[PDB]
Nucleic acid binder design. Structure first.
Lengths: 148, 238, 49
RNA sequence: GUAUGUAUUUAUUUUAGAACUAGUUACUAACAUUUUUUUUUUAAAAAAUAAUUAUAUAG
């Protein structure tokens, strides 16, 4: 409830305190790419970002904010949400090819890869914190799919 | 935050010899200040001495043959204690010549400065490393890596940024296409009055100067194939 | 205004301390190149009686 | 500190992992202002001397 994050088209990330209008942290690299989605893991020691180079980088939520890599999906076109398990061991993402990808947060290994009806891609992927092993994906097709 | 080393003549270790070799491979023989900047606690002249006296592979470190050894006694007789001239006459380093002359005619404390340190044998190192030598090899790898200028590095950065900028520009168009509003792609602007757009015309079209044979049906077959490809990219999308 | 004058501040006549040390403050940040740059932030002119 | 470059669209063109922790190096930053002469012994002894500073730097 004190600080917050923003990402922008100019390939940088800034962190502000609540109303200071001074960025206390600039996450900027040379070979970085902009991220259309940010999220914070439930263990609160990390927040991760879905970058434009078809990967997911992850940074600390403690001070001296510093940068694992989640790869195996093509999401360069659209900008796609990501969710986490309600225990904090699983991360789940969507794709431009109508399939979702679930990695294990503890080791960064791609566990499964489940396709979805509808030719159109899938962007918003959200997890149910109470009932475990339950995801919902949806996209430009229009229907709302309840994946296991 | 390092206190200043004003006198930099020391004992050549293994680390500094190896960084001098992998610096001479890249930087070359005649730039010595740029070599000696890479390894601290030594001087540009002492780097030059360590190359020309010891680390050079052209130098002759073997045992003396019998003709060589008699040649040494005779030359040391003719030219009294002119050891650079003698060592030039033997194609051997002068320190080797002096020590072997002492071995013929025969048959350092602590807290002293050794002047002959560049011509003497190296010291192998303790097993792990020292901390300053870890720092030295880190900055030495960092300086032996780079082969670019300022302009070229900025070009790498600008190409990556223009690439990601195009990706965002297509992302918003695909979102508005899903919404049902078709924003056409804007073109880059011309920096001068006759700057050329390359989809309007074949820009300097040269016709292939026809010959004796006839190309009507092959023209029609190509035109069919290209029109069908453009329609397929329009519907299905490549 | 030395330490031997020190009580001159507590006369009846009105007077003010002005101070500028926090007027121009900046924050250092990394650029896209190697060098860093400074951006100004809010300041205060400290005047009290 | 310049040079120089880059950014700023509305008036609608028809359909192997998890956690904890602190300092050492480089580089950069028009961003920021605790006396003089000695002597002597192994902390103490001697001798000595005098109404208060710049907003100015660029290829």
């Amino acid at each position: 409830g004190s600080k917050f994050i923003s990402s922008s088209e100019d390939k940088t990330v800034r962190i502000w305190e609540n109303q200071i209008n001074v960025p206390i942290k600039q996450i900027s690299d040379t070979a970085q790419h902009s991220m259309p989605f940010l999220n914070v893991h439930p263990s609160q020691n990390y927040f991760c970002a879905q970058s434009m180079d078809n990967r997911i980088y992850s940074f600390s939520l403690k001070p001296k904010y510093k940068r694992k890599i989640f790869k195996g999906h093509s999401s360069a076109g659209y900008g796609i949400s990501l969710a986490f398990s309600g225990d904090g061991r699983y991360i789940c993402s969507g794709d431009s090819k109508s399939r979702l990808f679930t990695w294990d947060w503890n080791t960064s290994r791609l566990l499964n890869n489940i396709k979805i009806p509808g030719n159109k891609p899938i962007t918003q992927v959200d997890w149910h914190p109470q009932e475990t092993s339950k995801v919902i994906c949806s996209g430009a097709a229009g229907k709302i799919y309840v994946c296991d | 935050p390092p206190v200043p080393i004003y006198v930099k003549g020391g004992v050549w270790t293994n680390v500094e010899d190896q960084i001098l070799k992998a610096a001479v491979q890249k930087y070359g023989t005649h730039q010595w200040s740029k070599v000696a900047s890479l390894l601290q606690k030594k001087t540009a002249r002492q780097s030059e001495l360590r190359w020309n006296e010891y680390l050079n592979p052209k130098l002759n470190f073997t045992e003396f043959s019998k003709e060589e050894d008699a040649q040494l006694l005779d030359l040391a007789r003719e030219l009294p204690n002119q050891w650079r001239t003698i060592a030039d006459m033997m194609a051997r380093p002068a320190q080797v010549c002096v020590e072997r002359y002492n071995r013929l005619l025969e048959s350092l404390k602590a807290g002293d400065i050794n002047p002959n340190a560049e011509t003497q044998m190296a010291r192998p190192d303790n097993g792990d490393l020292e901390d300053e030598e870890k720092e030295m090899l880190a900055e030495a790898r960092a300086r032996l890596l780079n082969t670019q200028g300022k302009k070229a590095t900025r070009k790498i950065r600008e190409r990556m940024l223009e690439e990601s900028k195009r990706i965002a520009e297509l992302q918003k168009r695909r979102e508005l296409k899903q919404a049902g509003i078709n924003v056409a792609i804007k073109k880059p602007k011309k920096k001068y009055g006759t700057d050329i757009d390359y989809n309007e015309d074949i820009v300097y079209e040269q016709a292939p100067m026809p010959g004796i044979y006839d190309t009507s049906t092959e023209d029609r077959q190509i035109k069919k194939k290209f029109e069908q490809f453009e329609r397929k990219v329009n519907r299905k999308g490549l | 205004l030395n330490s031997s004058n020190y009580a001159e501040l507590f006369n009846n006549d009105i007077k003010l301390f002005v101070d500028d040390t926090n007027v121009y403050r900046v924050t250092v940040h990394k650029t896209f190149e190697g060098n860093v740059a400074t951006k100004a932030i809010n300041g205060c002119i400290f005047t009290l009686n």
